[PDB]
Amino acid sequence: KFEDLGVGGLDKEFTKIFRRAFASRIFPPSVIEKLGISHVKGLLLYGPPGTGKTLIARKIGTMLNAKEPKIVNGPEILSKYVGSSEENIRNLFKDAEAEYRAKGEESSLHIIIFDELDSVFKQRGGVGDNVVNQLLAKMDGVDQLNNILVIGMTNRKDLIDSALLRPGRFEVQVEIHLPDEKGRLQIFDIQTKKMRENNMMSDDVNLAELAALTKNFSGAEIEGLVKSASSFAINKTVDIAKLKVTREDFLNALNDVTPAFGISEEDLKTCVEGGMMLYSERVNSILKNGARYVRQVRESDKSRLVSLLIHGPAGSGKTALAAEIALKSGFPFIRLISPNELSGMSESAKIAYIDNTFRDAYKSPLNILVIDSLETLVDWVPIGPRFSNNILQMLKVALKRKPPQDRRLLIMTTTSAYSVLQQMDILSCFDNEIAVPNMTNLDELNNVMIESNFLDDAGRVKVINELSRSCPNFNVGIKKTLTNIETARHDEDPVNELVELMTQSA
Amino acid sequence: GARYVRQVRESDKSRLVSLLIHGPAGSGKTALAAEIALKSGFPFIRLISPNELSGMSESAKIAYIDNTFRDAYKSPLNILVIDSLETLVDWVPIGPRFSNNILQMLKVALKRKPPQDRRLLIMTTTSAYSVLQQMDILSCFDNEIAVPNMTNLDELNNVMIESNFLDDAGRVKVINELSRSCPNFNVGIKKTLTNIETARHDEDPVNELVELMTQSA
Ligand SMILES: Nc1ncnc2c1ncn2[C@@H]1O[C@H](COP(=O)(O)OP(=O)(O)OP(=O)(O)O)[C@@H](O)[C@H]1O
Ligand SMILES: Nc1ncnc2c1ncn2[C@@H]1O[C@H](COP(=O)(O)OP(=O)(O)OP(=O)(O)O)[C@@H](O)[C@H]1O
Numbered sequence: 001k002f003e004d005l006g007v008g009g010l011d012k013e014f015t016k017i018f019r020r021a022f023a024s025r026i027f028p029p030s031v032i033e034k035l036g037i038s039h040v041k042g043l044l045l046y047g048p049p050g051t052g053k054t055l056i057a058r059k060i061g062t063m064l065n066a067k068e069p070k071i072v073n074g075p076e077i078l079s080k081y082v083g084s085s086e087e088n089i090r091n092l093f094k095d096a097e098a099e100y101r102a103k104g105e106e107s108s109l110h111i112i113i114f115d116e117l118d119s120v121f122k123q124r125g126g127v128g129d130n131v132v133n134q135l136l137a138k139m140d141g142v143d144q145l146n147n148i149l150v151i152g153m154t155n156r157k158d159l160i161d162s163a164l165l166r167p168g169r170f171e172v173q174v175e176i177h178l179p180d181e182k183g184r185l186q187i188f189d190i191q192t193k194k195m196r197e198n199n200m201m202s203d204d205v206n207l208a209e210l211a212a213l214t215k216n217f218s219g220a221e222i223e224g225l226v227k228s229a230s231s232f233a234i235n236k237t238v239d240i241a242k243l244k245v246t247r248e249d250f251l252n253a254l255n256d257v258t259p260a261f262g263i264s265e266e267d268l269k270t271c272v273e274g275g276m277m278l279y280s281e282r283v284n285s286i287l288k289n290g291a292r293y294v295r296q297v298r299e300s301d302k303s304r305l306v307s308l309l310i311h312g313p314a315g316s317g318k319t320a321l322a323a324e325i326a327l328k329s330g331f332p333f334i335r336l337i338s339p340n341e342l343s344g345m346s347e348s349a350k351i352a353y354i355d356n357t358f359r360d361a362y363k364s365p366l367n368i369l370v371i372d373s374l375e376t377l378v379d380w381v382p383i384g385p386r387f388s389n390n391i392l393q394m395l396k397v398a399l400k401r402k403p404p405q406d407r408r409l410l411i412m413t414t415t416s417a418y419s420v421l422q423q424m425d426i427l428s429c430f431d432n433e434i435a436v437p438n439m440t441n442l443d444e445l446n447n448v449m450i451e452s453n454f455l456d457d458a459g460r461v462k463v464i465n466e467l468s469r470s471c472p473n474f475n476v477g478i479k480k481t482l483t484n485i486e487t488a489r490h491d492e493d494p495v496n497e498l499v500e501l502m503t504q505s506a
Numbered sequence: 507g508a509r510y511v512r513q514v515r516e517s518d519k520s521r522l523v524s525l526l527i528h529g530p531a532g533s534g535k536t537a538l539a540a541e542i543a544l545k546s547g548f549p550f551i552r553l554i555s556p557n558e559l560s561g562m563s564e565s566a567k568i569a570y571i572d573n574t575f576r577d578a579y580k581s582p583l584n585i586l587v588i589d590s591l592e593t594l595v596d597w598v599p600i601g602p603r604f605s606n607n608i609l610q611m612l613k614v615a616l617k618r619k620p621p622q623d624r625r626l627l628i629m630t631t632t633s634a635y636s637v638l639q640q641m642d643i644l645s646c647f648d649n650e651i652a653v654p655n656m657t658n659l660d661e662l663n664n665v666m667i668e669s670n671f672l673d674d675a676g677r678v679k680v681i682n683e684l685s686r687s688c689p690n691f692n693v694g695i696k697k698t699l700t701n702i703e704t705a706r707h708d709e710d711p712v713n714e715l716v717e718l719m720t721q722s723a
């Protein structure tokens with residue numbers, strides 16, 4: 001029916017394909033001749049990479065007899081001699097034409113698989129125009145040819161020429177989603193079949209739990225997971241005929257693998273390497289508000305987009321709070337945009353990266369995406385002043401677009417130049433705002449130094465008393481506090497350095 | 507809008523009509539334009555938004571606009587909606603920087619008659635009337651509609667009854683509170699709806715909505 005072959009999770013799409021594509025190649029030729037209808041001569045199926053497009057193409061080829069598929073990929077076609085970039089697109093149709101001319105209407109179906117159709121075949125109006133014209137004149141031209149079928153696969157369907165998508169050239173258009181919970185269960189069933197019949201899979205593994213634990217897995221990462229678990233088991237063993245793979249191997253392999261549409265733990269973990277100390281009452285309120293907004297986004301029906309701004313004095317430790325709020329939510333898709341990643345690229349590459357990261361957040365059920373700085377991304381310098389308009393306009397457009405279909409998003413941006421944003425007139429894109437004030441007190445410093453154990457209580461008391469008698473209006477961020485504490489620790493005497501540093505810093 | 511559509515359909519000399527719907531930001535202009543478009547029946551309707559010219563290059567944007575306009579000249583009746591027009595010509599008020607080529611293209615393309623005996627109606631929205639005045643581009647439009655804000659409490663009550671939030675008692679309490687808690691009241695529909703939705707979650711009682719409306723206004 002559909003799953004007797006190796007494809008799981010794709011049910012509706014395959015019914016559509018079977019009804020529209022192979023509903024005229026199965027019936028007796030007499031009936032179809034009486035009806036007076038031709039055959040479909042194209043198929044464009046698009047979606048995120050690594051989801052099972054080539055597999056379905058090859059299975060379609062196999063299930064209908066047909067010769068071996070002829071495979072090609074976009075950028076390989078081009079050459080650097082006149083008339084060679086289009087000769088390659090002409091050599092793919094020779095054999096089918098010859099067989100059609102020789103045999104007639106009893107020929108055998110031929111298949112041609114095209115990969116990355118949006119790299120060369122872009123709207124015309126150069127080598128590109130010639131290539132598009134040469135394919136256009138060959139797919140449907142003056143000479144009839146109805147013993148062929150060409151499949152095309154792509155990830156961006158809104159760049160292909162507008163005449164290559166007309167009934168007669170590429171008639172059927174299909175979309176491939178990511179697997180659902182049942183899709184993952186079925187994929188697991190298909191993949192763990194050799195180890196099942198051959199009696200080398202323990203009786204403790206419960207694939208339902210494994211499917212439930214894997215979220216946003218793409219269907220190929222499952223294959224990697226199972227293979228890695230099997231390799232782990234064998235390598236642990238080396239009784240060679242008594243190998244058994246248990247739950248522990250699978251769980252370890254799962255722990256090792258990192259999905260492509262999942263959390264990026266390392267960055268969000270190194271962003272908070274200094275630790276989260278509750279030095280006052282504000283921190284709890286900030287975190288509570290963050291949690292409130294997370295919950296609102298999760299449980300709403302009409303609120304499918306929420307953009308949040310967090311701002312305050314420099315050094316107040318703003319990115320750490322955002323990272324902690326993100327790390328205590330549980331969403332399956334978390335991503336970060338920081339100046340470190342972008343540095344070194346050109347403006348065009350910067351825009352491309354900022355756009356692609358926003359186009360991968362519309363293919364998952366629940367997401368959360370963090371933007372850092374927002375003033376160094378725009379290249380701001382106060383003399384003249386200077387900055388980049390293109391990136392600014394890109395970010396402005398991206399912060400107001402609702403996600404497609406039924407999805408959800410929570411953008412969270414940090415800044416420390418409120419006034420500049422006000423001048424640029426960009427403050428209408430944000431829904432709610434949070435402020436992060438810095439330390440103005442002495443008990444806070446005492447709490448910080450007890451939590452960091454700067455010294456024994458004797459020196460701590462002495463230094464706090466000295467500062468109380470000297471500095472009345474202590475006002476500094478938490479980064480400078482920590483760095484000064486460390487510097488004093490590695491230096492000699494508390495009052496000699498710590499007090500002097502604090503006095504010169506406040 | 508209905509009058510203008512009817513004029514463009516059944517006439518002899520009017521073969522190109524422009525418009526300009528302008529008002530304060532958040533007043534809900536694009537919704538009105540879309541509603542006027544959906545109740546016409548014209549065979550051909552298309553829309554140009556900043557959401558589609560995202561991440562492109564300038565030349566690509568010009569080519570896209572050119573192709574759209576060219577495709578609009580091959581059918582008997584047509585309509586064409588344009589959004590912003592201060593964001594397509596990316597405008598930042600400091601310097602002030604913007605793009606001139608796209609501006610000139612749009613300025614030349616809004617005064618060209620369709621070939622032969624075709625007809626065309628164009629609706630373009632904006633929120634920077636003063637900027638357009640300064641650019642000296644206000645001569646390309648044949649008329650100008652205006653969209654104002656909300657300026658009464660009964661309108662808020664109507665919005666509430668339509669949004670299923672008041673529950674009668676809440677209506678009375680919140681209206682009475684805001685009667686003396688705010689002398690002047692002016693807010694767009696978008697922000698009002700957002701405030702209602704966010705108020706629904708926590709403390710459905712009048713307090714939350716009162717604070718939200720007071721701070722927003
Ligand atoms: N609430 C907090 N309690 C304790 N430490 C904190 C807190 N918030 C931030 N930090 C510390 O701040 C350190 C660095 O702060 P971070 O660089 O995030 O600050 P920032 O103000 O966003 O930076 P920038 O100066 O680049 O604008 C981290 O090592 C983290 O431990
Ligand atoms: N006449 C109306 N009656 C009821 N709701 C309306 C009306 N006009 C607009 N809306 C609402 O406005 C919301 C969308 O606002 P819209 O996009 O039209 O605003 P806008 O003026 O284009 O905004 P902006 O200036 O921020 O781009 C929708 O929720 C729509 O229902």
Ligand SMILES: Nc1ncnc2c1ncn2[C@@H]1O[C@H](COP(=O)(O)OP(=O)(O)O)[C@@H](O)[C@H]1O
Binds near residue numbers: 219223
């Ligand atoms: N629905 C599925 N069922 C079983 N295996 C799948 C499925 N989808 C993808 N795969 C696995 O992914 C690989 C197929 O490559 P594919 O993802 O089609 O490449 P691309 O999608 O980039 O063309 C094979 O290893 C195949 O087993």
